[PDB]
Amino acid sequence: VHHQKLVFFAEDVGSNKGAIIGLMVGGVVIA
Amino acid sequence: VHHQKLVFFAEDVGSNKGAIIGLMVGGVVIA
Amino acid sequence: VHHQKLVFFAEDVGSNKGAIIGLMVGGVVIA
Amino acid sequence: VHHQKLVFFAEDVGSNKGAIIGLMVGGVVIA
Amino acid sequence: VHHQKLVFFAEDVGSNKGAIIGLMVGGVVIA
Amino acid sequence: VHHQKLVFFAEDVGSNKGAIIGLMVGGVVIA
């Protein structure tokens, strides 16, 4: 298979106080 | 298969205090 | 198969205090 | 006059992604 | 006058991704 | 006048990714 640009932003992000995950597959994120 | 640009923003994001996930497949996100 | 731009915003997002998921397939998101 | 415990929680708060205000008297909150 | 414990939590707060304000009297909060 | 303990937590705060303000009277907070 092929994955690409799963998340994409074309313009500026101010902040990320949380989670940004291209491809969450297991385990535990807490943001 | 082929995946691409699953999430896309063309303009600026101010903030993300939560979760942004291209392709959640298992495990646990808490944002 | 082919997926693309599953979620798309063409203009600016102010905030995301919740979940934005291109393709949720299993597991647990809590935003 | 006397004010006290205007807002009160006795048990655990999970999250506050919004506004919690004891006493709003003017100005502008955006949560 | 007298103010006290305007906001009160007795048990644990998990997170505050927003605003918690004892006494908003003017100006601008954006959380 | 007299102010006291305007915001109060009795138990542990996990995180503050936003604003916690005893007494907002003017100006601009962005959290």
Curated annotation (Swiss-Prot), chains A, B, C, D, E, F:
This is P3(42). Changing M24V: No free radical production. No hippocampal neuron toxicity. It comes from the Eukaryota. The record marks K5, L6, F8, F9, V29, I30 as: Cleavage. It comes from Homo sapiens. Cu(2+) 2 binds at H2, H3. The record marks G22 as: Implicated in free radical propagation. The chain holds residues 683 to 713 of 770 of the full protein. Changing H2R: Only 23% zinc-induced amyloid-beta protein 28 aggregation. Residues 13-31 are annotated as: Interaction with PSEN1. The record marks M24 as: Susceptible to oxidation. Zn(2+) 2 binds at H2, H3.
